[PDB]
Design a protein around this ligand. Structure first.
Ligand code: MG
Ligand code: MG
Ligand code: MG
Ligand code: MG
Ligand code: MG
Ligand code: MG
Ligand code: MG
Ligand code: MG
Ligand code: MG
Ligand code: MG
Ligand code: MG
Ligand code: MG
Ligand code: MG
Ligand code: MG
Ligand code: MG
Ligand code: MG
Lengths: 60, 65, 106, 394, 152, 31
RNA sequence: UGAACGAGAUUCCCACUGUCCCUACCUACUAUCUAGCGAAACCACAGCCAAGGGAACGGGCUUGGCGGAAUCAGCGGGGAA
RNA sequence: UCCAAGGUGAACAGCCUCUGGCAUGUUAGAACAAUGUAGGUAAGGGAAGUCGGCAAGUCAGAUCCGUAACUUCGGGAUAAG
RNA sequence: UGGUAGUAGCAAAUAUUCAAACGAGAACUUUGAAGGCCGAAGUGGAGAAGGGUUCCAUGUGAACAGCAGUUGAACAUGGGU
C-alpha cells in the first residue's frame, strides 16, 4: 500500500499506475486524474483538492 | 381567421416590417373586418394594432471594450 | 373529489437522458404532458404558455434539470368531449428544488 | 487459386448457430457421473451474478516466479441464497435416452415458486398445485404417493431434485423464482429417494453443495449485444478505407463453386445472449449472509485473517447495477458469463480435479471494497470519514 | 347499381356501398377481411381501436414488407398494421349502413356484416420525376367498397 | 358545372411520346 | 544546361498522423417501425443439392440426398443476374 | 446588375447581433440494430498499410530574431531553425 | 393489365414548441408567446432578359400542389398598369 505522488491519497494494491522516469525516479499515481496533472507540471500545493494543499492551508 | 391582409397593410401603414406588427390576439374579429388602409389607420388609434419596439442591440458591451 | 390541484417536481433531467440536442426541449414538453396523464388520470392536457417559456428558457438543447409544476385537474363544463376533465399544467417559479415534496393545493 | 498466405478461420464452428438462447436460465446439459461410493450430495446450484472485484492473496505454487508473492486477481461475486427443494423426479434409462417416470412435488409450495407456473401472476387466481397438495393429506393420495416413491426406488436409475431460488432475499425486481432439476449423485436409488424425500420443503445452502478450493463450472447466457456486423460478430479484418459500398464486411463470402454460401462463411447476425458453459472456475471464498449472532446483525463477509476490518462484501454504494449482497455468496476466480443480476447455474466439474492449480488452497489476504461506481479510493465509510474529516453536511 | 351476393332475404338486411374512394386497395382489403362476420357494435369498436393503434389489422395476402406487431397474436398471424385511412372510410360506410337499417326499421343492435368486398376503382394518374430526365407513373389505387348487414 | 375535376386539369396535362428516345474494352491478353 | 515557376511524373529524409499492428467508442442523417403517399428495372416457366450423361459448367432429365404454411431484417455464393 | 448596419479582425474572411425576412426547403411520430453517408477521438508503436503517405494529420496569425545550396543577381524566402 | 409491391422511396443547406381562433376535420392555416436561422458579396429591398395575369380581393376544397391543408403561383368570379 503506497501513497499517490500527486494527490497524497492512499493507493491500494489494485489501483492506479506506476511511473518510472528516465532519471531513476519512480512515482505512484492514484488515477489518470492525478497522473495527467503531474505530467502537466501542475504544482500540487496549488491544487485545492490535494493533501499538500490542506496542509499548506491548514484545512485539516 | 386568416389575417395576412391586415398583417401586410399594417406594415405599410405603420411604415415598419411584418415582424414589428402586433395584432391583438383577443380582438381578431374586429381586425378581420379591416380590409382597407383607412380601417387599419383606425385600429392603430384604438390600440389593436401596435408597432412592437426594435429588438435591443445594446452597444454597452462595445462601448466598454 | 375530481377537481384537484397539486404541485410536483418533474425531474426533466432523467426524462430526456440520451436525446439529441435538437429534440431535448420538445421531448421535455412531451414528458411533462405524459407526467400529467400518469398522475392525473385524464387526457387532454393543456400546458400553460408560461411553462413553455420555462422549459425553453435556456435554448433547445439545455433544458432545466428539474422544474416545479402545478397539476390542476379541472372540468370542461363547456365542450362535449369524451374526457369532461382537463388538467392545466402551470409553472411554479422556484429558486431551490431541495426538499420540495409533493403537496396539495386548494 | 489457393490462398497464398495461410490464416486460421475467424471463429469456432462448434458454437453454431449464433442465435439468441431460447431460454434465459442456463441449462445443465450433463451432470457429473453418478458414483455410488461417495456420500449423497447435490451437483448443481443456482446463483446470481452480483458483480466483480479484485482480491489480494499469496500464491503458493513451488517453482514459479510468483511463488510466495502477493497478487491482485479479479473475482466475481455470485450471490447465492439458499434454495428450497419442492420436487423429486425419477428417470428411467430407455434405449431412446432418459425419460421422466415420476414427479413428486412437495406438499407446500411458496407463492414465489408458483410464480414460475404463470405468465400473468397478478391477474391469475393462485390455483397451481391446489388440488395436488390435497394428495398429501387424503388417505387415497397418500397411498398413491407411496406407490410413486416405491416406483422411483424400483424403476428409476437417475433421481433428480427440483429446487427454486428465494428471490425475496434479492434486491432484484423479479419476484418469479427459477426452478431447476439438480441431480443427486450419492448412492443407491433407495437412498437417493429417501434423502430427497426428507429434503422436501427444506432449504439447501451453497456451503453444502460446493466447497472451498473447488473447480466448478459456470453455465448461463452471455450478454446480449443485439444485431452485430461480421467485424464484431466474427472479428474479421476491416477492409481498407477506400472500399466502396462498405468496409466492415467480409469481402468474399464464397467461391463460384459451390454456387451456395457456406455455413462456415462468417455472416452478420445476432451477437451475444448465447448459452455458454465455462469450466474450471475456482471458488475463492464462500461468504455468509447477514445473520444476527448475539442481537447485532454482523456484516463481516469481506474480512480476512490479515485484514480484520468489519466490512461487508458490498463496496461503497453497493454493487453497481445490482444492489446489496445480503445472503451467502460465492467468489469465483476471474469473470463469468452474463450481465449483472444474471441467474447462473453453478455445476460441479465433470472432470477429476488433480492438477497443481485445482488443488491449490487459496487464502485471501485483502478483498477490495472500493466504490466501483467511479474511481473509489476508500474501503469503508469510517475510513473515508476519518481521512476527509468532518464536512459541511454535519 | 347491383351488389354481388344478393342477401338471402331482403327486408331483413341493409346495404351500403361506395365508389372511387381514395383509399389504398391493399390496405382496405385487409381491413374489410377483419370485419367480415363481425357484429357492427364489435366492428365499430374494432375500427376505432385500429385508428388508435389498439387492435391490429392482420395483413394476410398483401403482407410483403409489412412489419410484425405484438397485436398480431390475437389473429394467429405475424404481420399486422393499423390502417387509419382504411378504418375511417369503413367507419363512414358502416355508419351509413346503420342509417339504412334504421330507416328500413331493422334492429341495429343485431346487425352482422355477412358480406363485404373491396374492388379496384380506376387508377388516378400522377407523375413522378426520376433520374436522367425520365418520368415514371405515380398512380393511386382507389377501391370500390360494398357491404351487406344482416340480423342474426 | 358538375365537371370540375377534368375541366381544372385539362390545362395541366401534357402529352408524352409513346417511346422516350434516350441517349468495357474487353480484350484479354495471352493470345 | 538551367535560376524562378508547376492542382505535372518520380526517389529519399524529417515531422505528422487509426494507412497499418487492431480495432474500439461517440454524434448527425439514413437504414429500421408506424400514419399518409407510392414507383422502376426485370420476368418462357420458375427457383434446395451431389454425381452422371448432355451443345463437353442443370434448376427442370437420370440415379441418389431429400422436401412442411406465411414471412421480417440482412446478405452479396448462384441465377454462366 | 443596384443599395450594404454593429462587434471581432488587416479584411466585402470566418463567427455573433440589429433592420428586414423566413419556418429548415415535395411529410411526420417512435426507436438508436447491422451496413452506410457526414463529423470526431483513440493508449503504445509511427507508413510496418498501399501500385503509391491515397485519405487524414502536422504547420498556420502577428511580433521579435534567424534564414543556406543555387542563381539569369531579380530571386530562392513565410527557405529552414 | 400483372408479379415486383404497399417494396424502393417521401434523408443536401442546425429547429422547433405552447396556447388560442376559424372549421365536420389542425404536426402543416391564422394570431400571440417562446426558442432559432439568413447575419448587409442576406433566406433583405428594387430592376434588366425572360414569363404573361402568375398581381389584388372574395369564394371553392373536386382534380393538382409526390403527407395533409380551413392554404396556394391550383380552381371559380370580379378588379388592377
Ligand atoms: Mg427481488
Ligand atoms: Mg472508390
Ligand atoms: Mg466501475
Ligand atoms: Mg431534366
Ligand atoms: Mg500544375
Ligand atoms: Mg438455369
Ligand atoms: Mg451480365
Ligand atoms: Mg433540417
Ligand atoms: Mg495511436
Ligand atoms: Mg512499403
Ligand atoms: Mg494528400
Ligand atoms: Mg528551396
Ligand atoms: Mg396571390
Ligand atoms: Mg386568392
Ligand atoms: Mg398532396
Ligand atoms: Mg387560374
Amino acid at each position: 500500500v503506497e501513497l499517490c505522488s500527486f494527490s497524497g491519497y492512499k493507493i491500494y494494491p489494485g489501483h492506479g499506475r506506476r511511473y518510472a522516469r528516465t532519471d531513476g525516479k519512480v512515482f505512484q499515481f492514484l488515477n489518470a486524474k492525478c497522473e495527467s496533472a503531474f505530467l502537466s507540471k501542475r504544482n500540487p500545493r496549488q491544487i485545492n483538492w490535494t493533501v499538500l494543499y490542506r496542509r499548506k492551508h491548514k484545512k485539516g | 381567421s386568416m389575417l395576412r391582409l391586415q398583417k401586410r397593410l399594417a406594415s405599410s401603414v405603420l411604415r415598419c416590417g411584418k415582424k414589428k406588427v402586433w395584432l391583438d390576439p383577443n380582438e381578431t374579429n374586429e381586425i378581420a373586418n379591416a380590409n382597407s388602409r383607412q380601417q387599419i389607420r383606425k385600429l392603430v388609434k384604438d390600440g389593436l394594432i401596435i408597432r412592437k419596439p426594435v429588438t435591443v442591440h445594446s452597444r454597452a458591451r462595445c462601448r466598454k471594450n | 373529489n375530481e377537481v384537484v390541484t397539486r404541485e410536483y417536481t418533474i425531474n426533466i433531467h432523467k426524462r430526456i437522458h440520451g436525446i439529441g440536442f435538437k429534440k431535448r426541449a420538445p421531448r421535455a414538453l412531451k414528458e411533462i404532458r405524459k407526467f400529467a396523464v400518469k398522475e392525473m388520470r385524464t387526457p387532454d392536457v393543456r400546458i400553460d404558455t408560461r411553462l413553455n417559456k420555462a422549459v425553453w428558457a435556456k435554448g433547445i438543447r439545455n433544458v432545466p434539470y428539474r422544474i416545479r409544476v402545478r397539476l390542476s385537474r379541472k372540468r370542461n363544463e363547456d365542450e362535449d368531449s369524451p374526457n369532461k376533465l382537463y388538467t392545466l399544467v402551470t409553472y411554479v417559479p422556484v429558486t431551490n428544488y431541495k426538499g420540495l415534496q409533493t403537496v396539495n393545493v386548494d | 487459386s489457393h490462398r497464398k498466405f495461410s490464416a486460421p478461420r475467424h471463429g469456432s464452428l462448434g458454437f453454431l448457430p449464433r442465435k439468441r438462447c431460447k431460454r434465459h436460465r442456463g441449462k445443465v446439459k450433463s451432470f457429473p457421473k453418478d458414483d455410488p461410493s461417495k456420500p449423497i450430495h447435490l451437483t448443481a446450484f443456482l446463483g446470481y451474478k452480483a458483480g466483480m472485484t479484485h482480491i489480494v492473496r499469496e500464491v503458493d505454487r513451488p517453482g514459479s516466479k510468483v511463488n510466495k508473492k502477493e497478487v491482485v486477481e479479479a473475482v466475481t461475486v455470485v450471490e447465492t441464497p439458499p434454495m428450497v427443494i419442492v420436487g423429486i423426479v425419477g428417470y428411467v434409462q430407455t434405449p431412446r435416452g432418459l425419460r421422466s417416470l415420476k414427479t413428486i412435488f412437495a406438499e407446500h409450495i411458496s407463492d414465489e415458486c408458483k410464480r414460475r407456473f404463470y405468465k400473468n401472476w397478478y391477474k391469475s387466481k393462485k390455483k397451481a398445485f391446489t388440488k395436488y397438495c390435497k394428495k398429501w393429506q387424503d388417505e387415497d393420495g397418500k397411498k398413491q404417493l407411496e406407490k410413486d416413491f416405491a416406483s422411483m426406488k424400483k424403476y428409476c436409475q437417475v433421481i433428480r431434485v427440483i429446487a427454486h431460488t428465494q428471490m425475496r432475499l434479492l434486491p432484484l425486481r423479479q419476484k418469479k423464482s427459477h426452478l431447476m432439476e439438480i441431480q443427486v449423485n450419492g448412492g443407491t436409488i433407495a437412498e437417493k429417494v429417501d434423502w430427497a424425500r426428507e429434503k422436501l420443503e427444506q432449504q439447501v445452502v451453497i456451503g453444502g453443495v460446493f466447497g472451498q478450493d473447488e473447480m466448478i463450472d459456470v453455465i448461463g447466457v452471455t450478454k446480449g449485444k443485439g444485431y452485430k456486423g461480421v467485424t464484431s460478430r466474427w472479428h474479421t479484418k476491416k477492409l481498407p478505407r477506400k472500399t466502396h459500398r462498405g468496409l466492415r464486411k467480409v469481402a468474399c463470402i464464397g467461391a463460384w463453386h459451390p454456387a451456395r454460401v457456406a455455413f462456415s462463411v462468417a455472416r452478420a447476425g445476432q451477437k451475444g445472449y448465447h448459452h455458454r458453459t465455462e469450466i474450471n472456475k475456482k471458488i475463492y471464498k464462500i461468504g455468509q449472509g447477514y445473520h444476527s449472532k448475539d442481537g447485532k446483525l454482523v456484516k463481516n463477509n469481506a474480512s480476512t485473517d490479515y485484514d480484520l476490518s468489519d466490512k461487508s462484501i458490498n463496496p461503497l454504494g453497493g454493487f453497481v447495477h445490482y444492489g446489496e449482497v445480503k445472503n451467502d455468496f460465492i467468489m469465483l476466480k476471474g469473470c463469468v458469463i452474463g450481465t449483472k443480476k444474471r441467474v447462473l447455474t453453478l455445476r460441479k466439474s465433470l472432470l477429476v480435479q488433480t492438477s497443481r492449480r485445482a488443488l491449490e488452497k487459496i487464502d485471501l489476504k485483502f478483498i477490495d471494497t472500493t466504490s466501483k461506481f467511479g474511481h473509489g479510493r476508500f474501503q469503508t465509510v469510517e475510513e473515508k470519514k476519518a481521512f476527509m474529516g468532518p464536512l459541511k453536511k454535519d | 347499381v347491383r351488389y354481388s351476393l344478393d342477401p338471402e332475404n331482403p327486408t331483413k338486411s341493409c346495404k351500403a356501398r361506395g365508389s372511387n374512394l381514395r383509399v389504398h386497395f391493399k390496405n382496405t382489403r385487409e381491413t374489410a377481411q377483419a370485419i367480415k362476420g363481425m357484429h357492427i357494435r364489435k366492428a365499430t369498436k374494432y375500427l376505432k381501436d385500429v385508428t388508435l393503434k389498439k387492435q391490429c389489422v392482420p395483413f394476410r395476402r398483401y403482407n410483403g414488407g409489412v412489419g410484425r406487431c405484438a397485436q398480431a397474436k390475437q389473429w394467429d398471424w405475424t404481420q399486422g398494421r393499423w390502417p387509419k385511412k382504411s378504418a375511417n372510410f369503413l367507419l363512414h360506410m358502416l355508419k351509413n349502413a346503420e342509417s339504412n337499417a334504421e330507416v328500413k326499421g331493422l334492429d341495429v343492435d343485431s346487425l352482422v356484416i355477412e358480406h363485404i368486398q373491396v374492388n379496384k376503382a380506376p387508377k388516378m394518374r400522377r407523375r413522378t420525376y426520376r433520374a436522367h430526365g425520365r418520368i415514371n407513373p405515380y398512380m393511386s389505387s382507389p377501391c370500390h367498397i360494398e357491404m351487406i348487414l344482416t340480423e342474426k | 358545372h358538375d365537371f370540375p375535376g377534368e375541366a381544372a386539369q385539362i390545362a395541366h396535362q401534357k402529352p408524352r411520346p409513346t417511346v422516350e428516345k434516350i441517349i468495357l474494352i474487353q480484350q484479354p491478353r495471352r493470345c
